[PDB]
Amino acid sequence: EKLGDISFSLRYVPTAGKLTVVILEAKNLKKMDVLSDPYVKIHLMQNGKRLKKKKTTIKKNTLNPYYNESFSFEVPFEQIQKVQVVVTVLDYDKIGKNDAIGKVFVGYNSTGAELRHWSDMLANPRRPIAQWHTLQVEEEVDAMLAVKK
Ligand SMILES: [Pb+2]
């Protein structure tokens, strides 16, 4: 079963140590119940610890939400290859916990297209770079978050 895909942009401003993530949209999200009510959480992490959290508004009853919602984080130059930006799409439930639809992260210890997006940001400072990412199962991303390069 596919969980969906998420589009976001990354921008790093080295002089000011400012990291901006814009959640653009998601597509083909998993239908969670017998349609999902997606919102997106961002966690900035450094070695298991949460430095900052942000989240988008909620788009009710859609597998294909459009957000274009921007979030900024303070990350000094010397720390930018030590953090992870963790992006989770969740299903808002009025009565009960909000279950995760899928998850992805970018940062130096990411891989494949996640690493490429992060590296393209760092190679092209001050410019937002947009890219799509395949959402993965929360527990599998959590496992990989713990593998250092
Ligand atoms: Pb729901």
Taking the domains of the chain in order of start, what are their residue ranges? Answer: 1-149
Contacts of 45 (CB under 8 A, 6+ apart): 51, 83, 84, 85, 86, 145
Q: Is 120 annotated as a binding residue?
A: no
Angstrom distance (rounded) from CA 28 to CA 64: 6
Q: Is 37 annotated as a binding residue?
A: yes
What is the fold of 1-149? Answer: Immunoglobulin-like (2.60.40)
Q: Is 5 annotated as a binding residue?
A: no
Task: Look at the alpha carbons of 16, 10, 37, 136 in this order and tell me if their dihedral is positive or negative.
Answer: negative
CA of 130 to the centre of ligand 1 (A): 28
Q: What technique was this entry resolved by?
A: X-ray
* Resolution of the experimentally solved model in angstroms: 1.4
The structure tokens listed for 13 are 């401003």
CA of 95 to the centre of ligand 1 (A): 9
Amino acid code (one letter) for 47: N
CA of 100 to the centre of ligand 1 (A): 11
